[PDB]
Design a binder for these strands. Sequence first.
DNA 1: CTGTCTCACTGCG
DNA 2: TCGCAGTGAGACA
Length: 201
Amino acid sequence: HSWRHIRAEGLDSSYTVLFGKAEADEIFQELEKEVEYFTGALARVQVFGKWHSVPRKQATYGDAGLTYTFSGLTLSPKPWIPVLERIRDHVSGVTGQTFNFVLINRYKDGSDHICEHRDDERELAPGSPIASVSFGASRDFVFRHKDSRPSRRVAVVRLPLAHGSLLMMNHPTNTHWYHSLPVRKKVLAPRVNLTFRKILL
DNA sequence: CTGTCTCACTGCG
DNA sequence: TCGCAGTGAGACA
């Protein structure tokens, strides 16, 4: 109910803290114990003509039959597990939005990262928001306008994403802005991030 | 003078 | 330690 609003041209996002420390810690410990991450062939992506192992771990859970493809990699959902349904249900309650798929990214420390991109794949429902819930170490998240990488002097938006927090990325954020989690060498602890999405069957 | 796009890396500064 | 430029091998429209 108290949201920090993050707005610029084409940028509509909202940030809030959902869980206090003790609850967040408990959810984190459960995610650590319960989440199974893809390995090997399901952990390699193709970008700029080259194949790379992803510098983090990824997992996908969601309703049966759906798929999510990005960067030459196709991920299939594992069935929902209790800790994930709990988070999904809490997020639906607070936002009034629904989700049928989640991508989980785990950054073991500040050297694990994710390069900039847009979540704009064809199989995301038009106009649907992405809910980004974070546990573990706080890490800086960066929004960058697509015509500044240059054409326009539009400033980056930076914010720390804290333990137990929710970042709502609403349309049209993903049409107009790239996001990333840059390397932060001083961060030593892991971070687990869940991005709940609505996927087209 | 003039196509768009890249969930990743190295090579700088 | 951080952030930026240029990819790179295509696949498009």
